[PDB]
């Protein structure tokens, strides 16, 4: 996995937050911790990510209805339990197959609206997608379409390598 500190730095810049925070790391898993000015400390990649989205006055990225909010959090949890964990380690391809089926009829993870879930899933999948062969990217047609769209979404990709897809 991308180090949490680096991913939060990416997210800050993609959100347009001019002042980068300094994060500490807690426990053996190096879980990120944010100390807040005139607020409590926050622990956890997705927990801090949602807080940053709010700091950027972009709360719409967390979803705009009860359903969309739940779906966003489902995919954030998916990122930190399946993509970052053993599920990806042991069988990246069943994960890609399911994600490919899921994205068959959707532009973004929730549907028609871009959310924090697309950002974090893009950052989390990036190490796997860069390693896919040309044939693998043709097989996972929907993941490739979605990934290609996010990697070109204004301000998201930053320093990360572009992946080549066929249109």
């Amino acid at each position: 996995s991308m180090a949490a500190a680096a991913e939060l730095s990416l997210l800050e810049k993609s959100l347009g937050l001019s002042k980068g925070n300094k994060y500490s790391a807690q426990g053996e898993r190096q879980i990120p911790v944010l100390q807040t000015n005139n607020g409590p400390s926050l622990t956890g990649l997705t927990t801090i990510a949602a807080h940053l989205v709010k700091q950027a006055n972009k709360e719409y990225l967390l979803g705009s209805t009860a359903e969309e909010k739940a779906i966003v959090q489902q995919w954030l949890e998916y990122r930190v339990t399946q993509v970052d964990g053993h599920s990806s380690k042991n069988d990246i391809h069943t994960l890609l197959k399911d994600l490919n089926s899921y994205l068959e009829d959707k532009v973004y993870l929730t549907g028609y609206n871009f959310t924090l879930a697309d950002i974090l899933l893009y950052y989390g999948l990036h190490r796997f997608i860069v390693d896919l062969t040309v044939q693998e990217k043709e097989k996972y047609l929907n993941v490739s379409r979605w990934f290609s769209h996010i990697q070109h979404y204004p301000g998201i990709r930053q320093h990360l390598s572009s992946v080549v897809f066929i249109k």
Binding site: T43, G44, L45, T46, E67, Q73, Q74, E77
Partner: protein
Amino acid sequence: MRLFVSDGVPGCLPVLAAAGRARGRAEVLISTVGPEDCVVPFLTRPKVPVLQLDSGNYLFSTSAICRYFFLLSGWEQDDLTNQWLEWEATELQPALSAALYYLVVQGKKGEDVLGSVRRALTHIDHSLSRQNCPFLAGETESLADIVLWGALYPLLQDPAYLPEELSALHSWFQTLSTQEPCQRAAETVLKQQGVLALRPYLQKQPQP
């Protein structure tokens, strides 16, 4: 909308306890299913519980389902709740999974079970007694409480597995277990058989 559950699957515990928050905004149809029925079209392996929404979307994450029921009740998302739920999924769950496996599958007892979750239980106790309040983020039971209770209940229902030094954890747990929607869910999911109902599910799971 339709909630799919299966006998003795521990994830069904928090979602059933939360399902009442849906009372005003929607009817939740409950469908008791088999533990290897694949209800989600885009998922290869079967997963339960699952919520099939009126929109045709699927929630397959137990915490996301509970979050949805609370949101329907008018609950608002807060950072502390997110923190608890992220910790539950990434830190508590693997520890509980090892413990319940040791307890139910291998017949281990005492510290051979507890050792796996001691750090996580201590964390909850410490947070409950740092703040002066009886609930995790709130002044009344809310989403984090239901989620953590639902995960913990299958182990902590046996008071041998709640360390006496962790008194703050102790009260909170009893307080929640003595709430009607929790009792009912506990009864629905565990069929009043302690942890015995859990064995078929826990045996399909990987050893540590």
